Subunit: 375 residues, 4 copies
């Protein structure tokens, strides 16, 4: 019921608080309860999050026996030391082992739905990656970006309810609750109910107005897509772009991006700053990079700050406090890097510029690119 | 300003009412005014809507001289009789002809933005397909699906304002106004502000709740994607699916789709009906097809009616009036086939079941799959 | 022993004369002897010659139960009404059926060697397509181009020995015997011992010298590859090209080919003649085509005649007798269309121009493009 | 005239001896004579041997201004620091610069013939890579594998004539002369007249007979293709395979290759030896590798030695002298690594086993895989 995600949010948080296996399929729970780390597991797919389970820090909590891939099972190649088998071989092994769980590593509809139905048809206990992380107690032993943020959410319920009340539009509220429900339940369909295309990130959110004289701080410029998006929505008309990116390979790419615009009338308005955005000026290991505050990097009052960085977005925002507090530029702040960012970043921005309106959109079919908008 | 699309809607409708060239770039208008049907045009792209301009009924209203395609300009192949040239050859011709307009046939960001910027850089008058249709007065001489619905919208302003007031949620209202603004202005960025992914059509709209015992009428079943989507969101659990599709090639495909589910426990709950959905029972040219009303095709009360058909959706709904009026199933009704469908279909449904709530989402980056939801 | 293919030729011809199952694997012969047309067969591959067995005229001589394709077995699609299964499913069926033969339809090393080894590993009786045609007595019920020419060769042994003696070089003799051995034995490795690349057909045979003033009759011009090859080996320098092609779709393609050379200094030297080459002038069903003799089509003495046509190459050569007899142009005559062509075409040409030297090369990894050279 | 390559060989060697620019197009020679290292050059293609000219040791002998690639000229990417331009931009620059030479880096028919004709049509002086190496005096400053071996051949004429006389068959003689003519003239069409497919290397040469009990030394086993080829031509029947390969990444791949045969009845007959083949036992930088003689690595008399290694093939053969001299196995020795290998390797083998017959085939459309056969 996507029209009552506030209700499901509270119910999920209460359920998880008293049951750490909340959200784990019953048939898998009973195997794990029966066999513990002798549980036999088969990875479905060789192009998904299965690498995150195999690279896991410390001894695995189950015996991984194979990976299924119908397009590779005759190659003789191993998948993280595992044999690669056909789907037919997997259903055969499953019919004869009780006791054998399948990890569906696929994230996209075609492959995911295929393997999920194969499992259902044969009554094979199965899990997606977030469910695997929770069911096998791998919190802290996987990359933080694919970790279980359930418990963190359960500790901050009132603060999330307070954020919900502060959001300017109903769709942002639905989006907030959908993201928190995904983390509480491990159910990706929550994102799917609210998601917007990747192509609409920052520039087509339904919340911001761009003029023909924008001055954009492109913080975490990567490969230049946000510059391409500003160009597109403004029809090649802006005042200034300051692109900030510390990675040396990305900076090589941006030199290629700058060359595609060399004959435009706006080429001279774009600069690239090979540093990271932070709260002060310091040279640190990234390989050393320079880190500088936004307020020192730029030389004019911005109208828009886009932010998607590997480092602390809270430190980066503090390094832009004069720009934010004095000029109230529109902001598009990526909000999916830490379980705490939706609250922490919002709380920081409002403490320095309390008259902002706030929105939230989710822009991929996966857990990436939940983005806060301030205008 | 996507937060004031109601305002832009009224302003655009007033502007168009008194200027048929409303929405056409000034530099193109001045060429067309100066040269009329001696206007020289270059088609940019060979994989877009350019086929719709070349297949146009009756003499063209401009002299089309070439098509640009950097991946094909050495092949010796013609594009609808036109030479295929490089982008460099095009900019050269443009620098020497006043007077020469470019039709950007590309609909997707990469190719579209590329050609739009090429044109801007060199000051070359350019148009997208909807702008071309309006600027050259091709209304009625192109396929109705790619025609200019501007004037139709201008004739029905109060009825659209009345629809806006009837929609249950703000995002549906924003979506309504965004779609109408696209048609009034020929500006696709209006869709982009509100669009959701194609993958979320019907089953992930943010508005409907599906149970584990759904009985779905899949009207216009095509290649079986809606069956795959119901299976996915319900995790292989439903009571019944009646798939209705009249096209013989699609029916061959559905036999393949049915075979992928032969060993599932729900295979017996799905039937295929090789007919079209209409208001009564009649055999008509499509090649003859049988047309039957939904109320006669099905044998139980449905919980959900998905509808996307080539024929009249109003006739199809009248053929389901007993199901709709007596049982109030959820409905997902594709609303983009006629300029009048948003009003006509809604008005019909409410006259037979007035207690429905109504929503609207747009599910592609193009003009396809604007869908009404009733629940 | 490729250094004694003359010996193997005679031995194979004697073996076949007294055993129609010569060349058929013993384990398959014993199944066919035991079960006849109740023999169960599995087609390996869905992209090979398997369509030739399924389209076979009259009732099949075995019960075809499935086709193996690991990249398609979950699609629900049928292969000529057959279920598509995985290789693992096939080895399972084979382990339990005696009695079950596999037809390896693959012609190229990767896929062919894969399936051949799968069969050997599991002791599964298997056949290639030529072996299938012979083992099931399908001579005359398959396309003539993929038929068993064994018996025809056995009837003409001395004439083939006489051809061998007439060939000017040892490699042509080895090639002759390799082609005849393929047909006598159904063993494609015979072609492999002598084959040259497709890219060397006509222009890079190792036998012909082309000058800078060639006048080429391109008989069966198709899609213009021979024109491209003459251009390449002569570095854009020739006197004349007469391209002869009757198929209307090929003639559309040749207009595209002619456009790629429009600015060259040799464009005016090329003409296209939309007719078939034959012995006289007649309009016949191909859809009607004009058929004309080469001697009437051309307007000058040629230096080279390339020939690869669907119709009778003997009739086509008779329609060029004045050119051949009077001017002794170099000839490249495709020799793989009929079991009789190596003898019939050579005998004809020498009767009108007896001073020619003769060579033979085979230019694909399959049975296509065995070509006679006369110079 | 491929029927007189012995004659062309001697004429080319005499021409080169007295003219180092022999084989260079006259129009390019006159530019180079006029401008020397101020010659402006355009590289055609970004996927060929152009990297060999750009990575050249020491200052370039011309000013390289751009690279042409119609599929990349809008990317903003540079090709070894060079701008990437369209073919139309190149013809424009060429029409206005005298003085501007084009290097056609393409080696395959489609792309090579395209650029060669573009150049001819516009009268643009052009060269292939071997011609570039010779015309700009880059001998010794490019990778030895793509260097000009002309002068080396001119110093060894009688020894090559002596090799020609020792070859057992006419096609080997034609092949020898074709390879030497390529190096003397820089004209790749010489290879094309004699080349056989890559798929026929070692196992389908037209010269060797393989039994069902072969014992193969696979020297330079790489990625396991020769094992796959022996398996194919013998239909999975051999006695032993000793695979010798020193590269650690190749050895990882061979473990994958061994797994594809784990259930065959010949898996136990194959061993992998992670060392290089040389004349004695020594540990040397390749990263250190073990180098051992073949006679010590193997434990039985071989029937076949295939050899294609990065190191000295003469040292490797000396490390197999007992096997070669005592048992006369068939040999397939790659002969294209050094300008001297055809003479040096043959001379060595015959000094230890003088009763061998010798053949030679060339197995790619490029300069790779000229192979000597001894049987
Ligand atoms: Cl299950
Ligand atoms: Cl413009
Ligand atoms: Cl077998
Ligand atoms: Cl030239």
């Amino acid at each position: 019921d996507p029209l009552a995600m506030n209700d499901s949010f509270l119910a999920a948080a209460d359920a998880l608080a008293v049951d750490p296996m909340f959200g784990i399929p019953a048939n898998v729970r009973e195997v794990i309860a029966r066999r513990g780390n002798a549980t036999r597991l088969v990875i479905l797919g060789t192009k998904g999050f299965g690498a995150h389970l195999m690279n896991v820090r410390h001894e695995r909590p189950c015996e991984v026996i194979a990976a299924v891939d119908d397009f590779r099972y005759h190659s003789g190649e191993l998948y993280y030391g595992l044999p690669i088998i056909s789907t037919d071989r997997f259903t055969e092994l499953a019919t004869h082992d009780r006791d054998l769980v399948a990890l569906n590593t696929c994230r996209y509809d075609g492959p995911k739905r295929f393997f999920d139905q194969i499992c259902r048809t044969h009554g094979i206990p199965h899990l997606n990656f977030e469910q695997a992380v929770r069911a096998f107690g791998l919190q802290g032993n996987v990359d933080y970006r694919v970790d279980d943020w359930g418990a963190d959410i359960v500790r901050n319920i009132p603060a999330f309810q307070t954020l919900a009340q502060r959001l300017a539009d109903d769709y942002s509220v639905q989006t907030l609750y959908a993201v928190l429900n995904f983390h509480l339940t491990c159910e990706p369909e929550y994102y799917h109910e609210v998601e917007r295309p990747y192509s609409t990130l920052y520039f087509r959110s339904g919340l911001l107005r761009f003029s023909d004289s924008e001055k954009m701080v492109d913080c975490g410029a990567s490969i230049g897509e946000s510059l391409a998006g500003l160009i597109g929505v403004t029809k090649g008309k802006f005042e200034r772009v300051w692109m900030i990116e510390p990675d040396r390979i990305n900076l090589q790419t941006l030199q290629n991006v700058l060359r595609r615009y060399t004959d435009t009338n706006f080429a001279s308005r774009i600069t690239v700053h090979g540093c990271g955005a932070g709260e002060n000026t310091i040279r640190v290991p990234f390989d050393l990079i320079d880190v500088r505050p936004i307020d020192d990097i730029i030389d004019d009052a911005p109208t828009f700050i886009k932010m998607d960085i590997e480092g602390s977005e809270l430190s980066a925002l503090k390094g832009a406090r004069r720009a934010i507090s004095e000029h109230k530029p529109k902001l598009a702040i990526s909000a999916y890097h830490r379980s705490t960012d939706l609250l922490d970043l919002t709380n920081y921005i409002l403490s320095i510029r309390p008259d902002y309106q706030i929105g939230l959109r989710h822009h991929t079919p996966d857990r990436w690119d939940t983005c806060l908008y301030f205008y």
